[PDB]
Amino acid sequence: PEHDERKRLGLKTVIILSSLYLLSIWVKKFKWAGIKTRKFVFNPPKPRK
Amino acid sequence: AEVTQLSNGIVVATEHNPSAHTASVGVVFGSGAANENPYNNGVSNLWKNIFLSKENSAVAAKEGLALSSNISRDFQSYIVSSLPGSTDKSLDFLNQSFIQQKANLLSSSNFEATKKSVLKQVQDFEENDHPNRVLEHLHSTAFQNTPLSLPTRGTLESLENLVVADLESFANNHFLNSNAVVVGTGNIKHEDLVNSIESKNLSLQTGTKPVLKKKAAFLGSEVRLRDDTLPKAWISLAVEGEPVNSPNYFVAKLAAQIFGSYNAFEPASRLQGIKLLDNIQEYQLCDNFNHFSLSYKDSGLWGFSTATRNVTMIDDLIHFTLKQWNRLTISVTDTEVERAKSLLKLQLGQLYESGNPVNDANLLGAEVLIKGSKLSLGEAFKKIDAITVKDVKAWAGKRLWDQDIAIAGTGQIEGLLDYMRIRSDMSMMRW
Numbered sequence A: 001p002e003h004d005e006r007k008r009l010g011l012k013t014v015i016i017l018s019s020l021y022l023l024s025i026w027v028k029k030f031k032w033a034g035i036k037t038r039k040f041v042f043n044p045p046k047p048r049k
Numbered sequence B: 001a002e003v004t005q006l007s008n009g010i011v012v013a014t015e016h017n018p019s020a021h022t023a024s025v026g027v028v029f030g031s032g033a034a035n036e037n038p039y040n041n042g043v044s045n046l047w048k049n050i051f052l053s054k055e056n057s058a059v060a061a062k063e064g065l066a067l068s069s070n071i072s073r074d075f076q077s078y079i080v081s082s083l084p085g086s087t088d089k090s091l092d093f094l095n096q097s098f099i100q101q102k103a104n105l106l107s108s109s110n111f112e113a114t115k116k117s118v119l120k121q122v123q124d125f126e127e128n129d130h131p132n133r134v135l136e137h138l139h140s141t142a143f144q145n146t147p148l149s150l151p152t153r154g155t156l157e158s159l160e161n162l163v164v165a166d167l168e169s170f171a172n173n174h175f176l177n178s179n180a181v182v183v184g185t186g187n188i189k190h191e192d193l194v195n196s197i198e199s200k201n202l203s204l205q206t207g208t209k210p211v212l213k214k215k216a217a218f219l220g221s222e223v224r225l226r227d228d229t230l231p232k233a234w235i236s237l238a239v240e241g242e243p244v245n246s247p248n249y250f251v252a253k254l255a256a257q258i259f260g261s262y263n264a265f266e267p268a269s270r271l272q273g274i275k276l277l278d279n280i281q282e283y284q285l286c287d288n289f290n291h292f293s294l295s296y297k298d299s300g301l302w303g304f305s306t307a308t309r310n311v312t313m314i315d316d317l318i319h320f321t322l323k324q325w326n327r328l329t330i331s332v333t334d335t336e337v338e339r340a341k342s343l344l345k346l347q348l349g350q351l352y353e354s355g356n357p358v359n360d361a362n363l364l365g366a367e368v369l370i371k372g373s374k375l376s377l378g379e380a381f382k383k384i385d386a387i388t389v390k391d392v393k394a395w396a397g398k399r400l401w402d403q404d405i406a407i408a409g410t411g412q413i414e415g416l417l418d419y420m421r422i423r424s425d426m427s428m429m430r431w
């Protein structure tokens, strides 16, 4: 007997949670931009330490 | 203590002071290390040296004349110092072998002995002078791919690929008549210098130097040079600042005096009226710090520089300092503005009213090249007294509240966190 009520609250939950899942992918890639573009150079030290 | 400019085609500035015992005469050019490309870098550092080379300075010591020079960004200088009844011999030394017959200084044996002395100054600088080679990397990472980032000494491989053909190529384009100011400070009248210059027809030829393709631009970045065999950690950090002839010039200098400088081993330094010193001294987070406000004709840099030996609590020293910067926007008090007014007038007075006429010749030559005339100490004191609390909060919310930073460090900097954990500290999130 809950069948028509169930599919109407399933509409509100899926729309909300899909727009929260898409925004978390954008937010993660902005805060992770400095680590993916970090660089590294090696010059060997002069050897009598 | 009044300044006098008089252009007969050549700008001649002079501040007389008849209570001095010496007198300086030199020429200051308006092209510095920010007028070079990355292949002739540090070529002005080889023009200072060969002016101070041993065969050139032996000739000056036979008449009682001392030589001095200085290479920076936006200007260079070549000063000749003497006794106040002997300034006509000072012009004749600048005229010969620097202006007119400047060919015998650029020999093959005098150049080769000089270059291998400049090659060992920059090599000892790169291994020993840690608070000054970190501040150089702060200019190198904040203005990258832009004129304002080349080091004033040059680098070790840009100095090795430098031949004698490169120096006259630099002098032909930059030591011109309109890019030049002739200064004289100390015990010397303004009119005896002007007549003695135009007693001959001292001049130069062309003018209209090259016109500086790329402008200056700030970029948020960081550079890390970790060295685990050094016993300390050195760190600098800054934001964009106020340039020369900016309307917030004295307002940015007053803000750095609010936080000032510190030395942990001086007892009177630990008693200053700085609110940051309550958190520092509880666990002894550093050895020293100092706040600065650099300014050029393009932009500026506002920040601080530290050196610590507590290598496991580095992230608390950065956290507590950047939290106090937030208070300039939201909750700065009126007794902190009045304390920094008195200390700024004392710091400006000891730089512009010292006893060295060589020091006052680099200061006078820069302000006449970039503005045409000098600003008095009475007019600068009148401007500092008229700053309010509202002007500091209007400057701070524009320049430091939620803005990008530039970081540089060396030593045991493993405890220094990455960029976004430091970048988020530029807004308190309590306003």
Ligand SMILES: CCCCCCCCCCCCCCC(=O)O[C@H](COC(=O)CCCCCCCCCCCC)COP(=O)(O)O
Pocket: A009, A012, A013, A014, A016, A017
């Ligand atoms: C502590 C319990 C955690 C539950 C985990 C959720 C697992 C997903 C299954 C969905 C069941 C939840 C029922 C929601 C519902 O019926 O609301 C429905 C529709 O409302 C919604 O869409 C709510 C979206 C649910 C997303 C929750 C956001 C996560 C933020 C933290 C939440 C935990 C503190 C009720 O609608 P109405 O009360 O306005 O009439």
